[PDB]
């Protein structure tokens, strides 16, 4: 939440559901990275 909070303000129409905008969504994203499923997309979103 501190790092990528509200920084997903991408102008494009593409939707990124795994973000860190509030606490429940940050928990879900961290858990998803933990299970390892599709964590590279989260990393790419954070990089961009």
């Amino acid at each position: 939440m501190q790092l990528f909070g509200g920084r997903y303000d991408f102008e494009d129409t593409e939707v990124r559901r795994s973000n860190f905008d509030n606490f429940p969504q940050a928990l879900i994203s961290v858990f998803q990275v933990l299970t390892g499923e599709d964590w590279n997309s989260v990393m790419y979103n954070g990089i961009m």
Binding site: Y8, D9, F10, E11, D12, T13, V15, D21, N22
Partner: protein, 973 residues
């Protein structure tokens, strides 16, 4: 250097030789004599500038009243039929039979949509419709993204069918009606007669984006003029997709405003400010809307939200009253995402009376609270909308007009007044038209007052199209001078009718495209704006024309005679001539009609031919068999009769005219006898001149071709070998040299074009023309224009035989009023004849315009073809410059210096001609060159639009409008 006496003698010899050449070759006095020799085959009739305008205004008023009668019929019948609709739900039993436009014409389509039955029309071709139309039934247009077969849609197609009988009755009462259309509030459009839609759905790679709710006539008839203020949230939280959607939505909302509406866009993030250089409400015409769109597509999101500051700013801007305003519908449109403060104190402080509507928009997908903005919406008599994606923008940014029409509905029969839109381009490719609108109310249980809930909205708008060609048929111009014309104006300054109004759309700014972001298969939109051209932008602006326009805007009738600067038909010259303006108001409507007549045009020639054999001889005269004997003849494609039609092909049109006059008698039971008689008389006179005078001297040394152009539409070029070199319009009323010769009182030299394919430099020759002046009973008449084409080489020999061929010491040139080169002295400029002098000698040209021997001034052309730059063809503004003589002084002398040089010049003006003689030292004496003086259409973007809004042109908005009714419910959001 040669002195003044020598040069006076030289130029006097040249002017005498040229004047004698033109006078004794063209034969002006011969034509004058034969015009004055008869005085019995025609009569001289006055052109009363007062009676003509009254007659034309009455005809226009009667046509518009006729058109409005067919509107009230449609409105009443639609209301009555809809009041008794049943609203069923199961349509699979009794299908709905209708003809859906933009569907394929194949009988094997096998649509078989549940609940609808199709129709296959016959589609005969038609006139007054340059399409194929069917008069049996009416076509239905449903937008692409709106599903046909819905319960809402199928119910509209069920009760609206009853309009076909009224459509057919309207046509049979007046067979000249154009499209009659009902625009439904559900997106439907039922128009008559049936005709296939211009852009079908997906048979080609293209699609159509046509919603009747966004058309200018529907928007005009659906509500009253607005005072809109768009308040955009640019706080930090709108960063991302919601900012982009906000920008697109603001542009789309601006697309729904007209010239009676006043708009301004403001933004706020902890501080409220305007987005552009306007700072108050502006007229919301094409230019101001373009500026607002450009400013809106530049906002960034940064800061903290503060609704109180933004609403205070918006209300203060709505309370200005220092500027021009619609003064009817004060509304605020808030574009945000969500918040937590509803700002009750601001609304209590500023509109406790609820004189301002607040429409709120929630843009994007977000988790912010939307309750506060819904409360803001339906506390202040407004509405609340959600725009989550791009597909929602078009439908959500136009539905605010349902709310604004509630007072108009509650007014009742007071609001059923016919309004006429601005000039625009028909969606079915018919030309420039205007539409008359009338709203249709929903009256269900009107006599019992049961619901009255959805009765607060309109059913739709009825429209009837009138083409500008229909109006122009009521203002005939062939008894007038080529310089005379009609023009009609709005109570907005815009021209309904003008010679300079063209079917092209009005251009704005400079067209910039990015070819690298352009997919090949996407079908981008083209244009939807109306053709609004101000009166001052269609002619040369003058301090008296502004007074005349202001006087005829506010319904006043008067007359005025004054001196004015007249731009030529081709934008290369400017002439000074007396003109008389006579104007009167059209009673039924808000238009004002004026007739511009020069002097020498108050009387015209009316043929009095009554001998059939003479008519036959004059008719056979203009036969192609003896073009060798009587000279090649051209005929103006005028509407002599309704059977033969112009066909942009003069040989076959002349053949059709000949067989038409020879086959059936010239008694003309249904044709125009006056035009035909005038044409025959002029043909006979021109032939008499050709046979008696031009034929005697078949070959003349310096003369290449001899031409005569007369009123009526007869043009004769004596050498048939010179016929194919004649590039002038067969219509004599569109020939620039004709009008220039009419204005001037001497011989006029027209410089040939440059960089144009075809024989125009040496194989055609220089054109000199003069206007024939005759006196029948002491009355001015200028019926014909005669002139010759002079050899370039013979003129060169006349010139050289100081000023010597290819002289390296002295340059001697001849220019016309306009700075175009006509005769050089070194055979390098001579090859580039017809150029502006500033293209070859910019320093001397600039000094000449500075010593005040040449006067110039600039104007803007708002309907031009432009090539997009990098920052096919598009439309923009081009700046035009024309040069002309200023004083009557003949001889000017001086020295011009460019970088410690000294070139002595002495210009002299040729008497009784629009020419000028210049001598100067060679350009090799001083190699100086600053920059060329371009005289050409230059792509432009001016004027600066947010300096015109400080002192805008006089305007008179509508005086009757409906808002703030007590009975309105306003419990919806």
């Amino acid at each position: 250097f040669p002195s003044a006496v020598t040069i006076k003698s030289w130029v006097d010899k040249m002017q005498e030789d040229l004047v004698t050449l033109a006078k004794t070759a063209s034969g002006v006095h011969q034509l004058v004599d034969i015009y004055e020799k008869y005085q019995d085959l025609y009569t001289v009739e006055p052109n009363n500038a007062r009676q003509l305008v009254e007659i034309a205004a009455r005809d226009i008023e009667k046509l518009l009243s006729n058109r409005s009668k067919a509107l009230v019929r449609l409105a009443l019948e639609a209301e009555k039929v809809q009041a008794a609709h049943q609203w069923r739900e199961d349509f699979a039993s009794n299908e709905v039979v209708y003809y859906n436009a933009k569907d394929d014409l194949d009988p094997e389509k096998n649509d078989s949509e549940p609940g609808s039955q199709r129709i296959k029309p016959v589609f005969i071709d038609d006139a007054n419709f340059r399409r194929q139309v069917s008069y049996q039934h009416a076509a239905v247009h449903i937008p692409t993204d709106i599903y046909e077969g819905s319960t809402i849609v199928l119910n509209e197609l069920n009760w609206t069918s009853a309009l076909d009988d009224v459509f057919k009755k309207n046509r049979e009462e007046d067979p000249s009606l154009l499209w009659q259309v009902f625009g439904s509030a559900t997106g439907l459009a039922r128009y008559y007669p049936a005709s296939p839609w211009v852009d079908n759905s997906r048979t080609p790679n293209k699609i159509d984006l046509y919603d009747v709710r966004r058309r200018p006539w529907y928007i005009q008839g659906a509500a009253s003029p607005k005072d809109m203020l768009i308040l955009v949230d640019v706080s930090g939280s709108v960063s991302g997709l919601t900012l982009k959607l906000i920008r697109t939505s603001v542009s789309e909302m601006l697309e729904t405003l007209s010239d009676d509406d006043f708009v301004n866009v403001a933004s706020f993030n902890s501080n409220a400010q305007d987005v552009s250089c306007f700072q108050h409400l502006v007229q919301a015409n094409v230019r101001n809307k373009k500026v607002l769109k450009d400013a809106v597509n530049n906002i960034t999101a940064k800061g903290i939200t503060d609704y109180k500051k933004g609403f205070s700013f918006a209300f203060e801007q709505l309370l200005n009253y220092n500027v021009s305003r619609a003064n009817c519908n004060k509304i605020i449109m808030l574009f945000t995402d969500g918040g937590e403060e509803r700002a009750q104190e601001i609304f209590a402080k500023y509109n406790k009376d609820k004189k301002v509507r607040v429409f709120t928009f929630s843009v994007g997908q977000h988790n912010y609270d939307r309750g506060p903005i819904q409360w803001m919406a339906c506390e202040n008599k407004g509405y609340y909308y959600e725009i989550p994606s791009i597909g929602a923008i078009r439908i959500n940014t136009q539905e605010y007009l349902d709310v604004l029409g509630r007072p108009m509905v509650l007014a009742g029969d007071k609001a059923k007044q016919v309004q006429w839109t601005n000039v625009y381009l028909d969606a079915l490719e018919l030309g420039l038209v205007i539409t008359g609108t009338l709203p249709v109310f929903n009256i269900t249980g009107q006599f019992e007052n049961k619901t009255n809930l959805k009765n607060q909205l309109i059913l739709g708008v009825m429209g009837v199209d009138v083409s500008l060609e229909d109006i122009k048929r009521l203002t005939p111009r062939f008894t007038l001078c080529p310089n005379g014309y009609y023009f009609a104006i709005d109570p907005n300054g815009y021209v309904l009718l003008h010679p300079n109004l063209q079917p092209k759309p009005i251009g704005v700014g400079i067209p910039t495209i990015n070819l690298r972001k352009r997919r090949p298969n996407v079908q981008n939109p083209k244009s939807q704006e109306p053709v609004t051209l101000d009166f001052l932008d269609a002619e040369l602006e003058n301090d008296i024309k502004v007074e005349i326009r202001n006087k005829m805007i506010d319904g006043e009738s008067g007359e005025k005679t004054f001196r004015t600067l007249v731009k030529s038909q081709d934008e290369r010259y400017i002439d000074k001539g007396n003109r008389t303006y006579t104007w009167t108001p059209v009673n039924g409507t808000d238009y004002s009609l004026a007739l511009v007549l020069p002097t020498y045009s108050f009387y015209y020639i009316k043929a009095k031919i009554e001998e059939t054999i003479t008519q036959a001889r004059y008719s056979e005269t203009l036969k192609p068999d003896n073009f060798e004997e009587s000279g090649y003849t051209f005929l103006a494609p005028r509407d002599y009769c309704s059977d033969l039609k112009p066909s942009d092909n003069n040989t076959e049109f002349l053949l059709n005219f000949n067989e038409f006059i020879d086959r059936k008698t010239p008694n003309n039971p249904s044709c125009n006898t006056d035009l035909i008689n005038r044409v025959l008389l002029d043909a006979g006179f021109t032939n008499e001149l050709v046979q008696n005078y031009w034929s005697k001297q078949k070959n003349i040394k310096g003369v290449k071709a001899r031409f005569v152009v007369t009123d009526g539409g007869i043009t004769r070029v004596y050498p048939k070998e010179a016929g194919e070199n004649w590039q002038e319009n067969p219509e004599t009323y569109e020939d620039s040299f004709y009008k220039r010769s009419l204005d001037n009182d001497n011989y006029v030299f027209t410089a040939p074009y440059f960089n144009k394919s075809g024989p125009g430099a040496y194989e055609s020759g220089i054109m000199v023309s003069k206007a024939v002046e005759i006196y029948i009973q002491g009355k001015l008449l200028k019926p014909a224009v005669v002139g010759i084409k002079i050899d370039v080489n013979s003129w060169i020999e006349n010139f050289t035989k100081d000023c010597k061929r290819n002289s390296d010491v002295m340059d001697c040139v001849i220019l016309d009023d306009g700075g175009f080169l006509l005769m050089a002295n070194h055979d390098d400029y001579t090859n580039q004849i017809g150029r502006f002098f500033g293209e070859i000698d910019p320093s001397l040209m600039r000094h000449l315009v500075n010593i005040s021997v040449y006067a110039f001034n600039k104007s803007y052309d708002y309907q031009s073809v432009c090539e997009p730059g990098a920052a096919s063809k598009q439309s923009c503004i081009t700046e035009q410059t024309q040069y002309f003589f200023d004083n009557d002084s003949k001889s000017f002398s001086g020295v011009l210096d460019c970088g410690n040089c000294s070139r002595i010049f002495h210009v002299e003006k040729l008497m009784n001609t629009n020419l000028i003689f210049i001598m100067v030292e060679s350009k090799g004496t001083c190699p100086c060159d600053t920059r060329l003086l371009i005289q050409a259409e230059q792509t432009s973007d001016g004027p600066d639009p947010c300096d015109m809004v400080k002192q805008p042109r006089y305007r008179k908005g509508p005086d009757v409008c409906f808002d703030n009714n007590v009975l309105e419910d306003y419990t919806d959001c």
